[PDB]
Amino acid sequence: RVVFDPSNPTTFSVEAIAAYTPVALIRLLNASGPLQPGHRVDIADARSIYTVGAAASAARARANHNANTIRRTAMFAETDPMTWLRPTVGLKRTFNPRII
Amino acid sequence: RVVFDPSNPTTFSVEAIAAYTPVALIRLLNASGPLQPGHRVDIADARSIYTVGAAASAARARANHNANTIRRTAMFAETDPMTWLRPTVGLKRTFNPRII
Amino acid sequence: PADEEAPTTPEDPRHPLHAHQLVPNSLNVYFHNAHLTVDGDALLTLQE
């Protein structure tokens, strides 16, 4: 959709897209912009938007898993304001977090 | 059926015949050309028609499994019209193409 | 869904290594190129 346009996605619909069909979509286009809308702009920004967009896409996509996955806890010492009267401990994230 | 005719097969009649049948049809038939009815055409197209017809009959015979298989995609690099913004990658076909 | 266990074998449908999930140009193809039968609960953790 937004390929023949100067940086017009601007990290808006890419995250509204899922984490499967966007990559299933870039593989569908068969041409680029002849007038080069999204190419006449310095491509340096034409890159730095799609990436962060897909990032937030996958982030909000997995945000649902935070309902069946544990709150990720610190794995290191990381002295605590209540580190008196008890010494902190890390936690090696070895367990399978998938609850039942 | 088709032994006594010059080039009449021409991957047209045998096109619709199945795969297990012509393998059966040819071990079935037991006739040599009395008038050289199909033997007047030399080796040039004596077998050419048969091979292309078997190809057509297998293709029509194997087209059915395509309804429950995965899409054949790029096996190699094979640069894309969207080669930028993501690197095109091949795919080893080591998985089982039989869908549930 | 959140009612059952995670997939284990690569011939399992809900497994990222079935024939289905092999979407072209997905980071799953590398792990199947390398023939590493790793599940998705690990792939999920690359985000952090």
At residue A25, the 3 state secondary structure works out as helix
The contacts of residue A61 (CB under 8 Å, 6+ apart) are A18, A19
Contacts of B82 in chain A (CB under 8 A): 3, 26-27, 29, 32
Structure tokens at A36: 């080069």
What Cα–Cα distance (Å) separates residue A44 from each residue in A12, A26, B26, B86?
18, 19, 66, 14
Experimental structure resolution, Å: 5.3
Cβ separation C24–B91 shorter than 8 A: yes
Q: Which residue has the tokens 């038939």?
A: B29
Contacts of B95 in chain C (CB under 8 A): 10, 17-19, 22, 32
Contacts of C35 in chain B (CB under 8 A): 94
Which of A23, A27, A29, A32 is best to mutate for the B interface (most B CBs within 10 A)? A27
Angle ∠(A59,A65,A69) on CA atoms, nearest 5: 120
Contacts of A41 in chain B (CB under 8 A): none
The contacts of residue A99 (CB under 8 Å, 6+ apart) are A68, A69, A70, C2
Pairwise CA distance, residues A54 & A66, whole Å: 19
What Cα–Cα distance (Å) separates residue B100 from each residue in A43, A85, B67, B70, C35?
44, 59, 11, 11, 22
From the list A54, A32, A19, A42, the residue with the least C-alpha distance to B82 is: A32
From the number of C-beta atoms within 10 Å of its C-beta (0-12, 13-18, 19+), residue C1 rates as exposed
Residue A98's φ and ψ, nearest 5 degrees, are -70, 105
Pick the residue from chain B with its C-alpha nearest to C24.
B73
Cβ separation B94–C32 shorter than 8 A: yes
Method of determination used here: cryo-EM
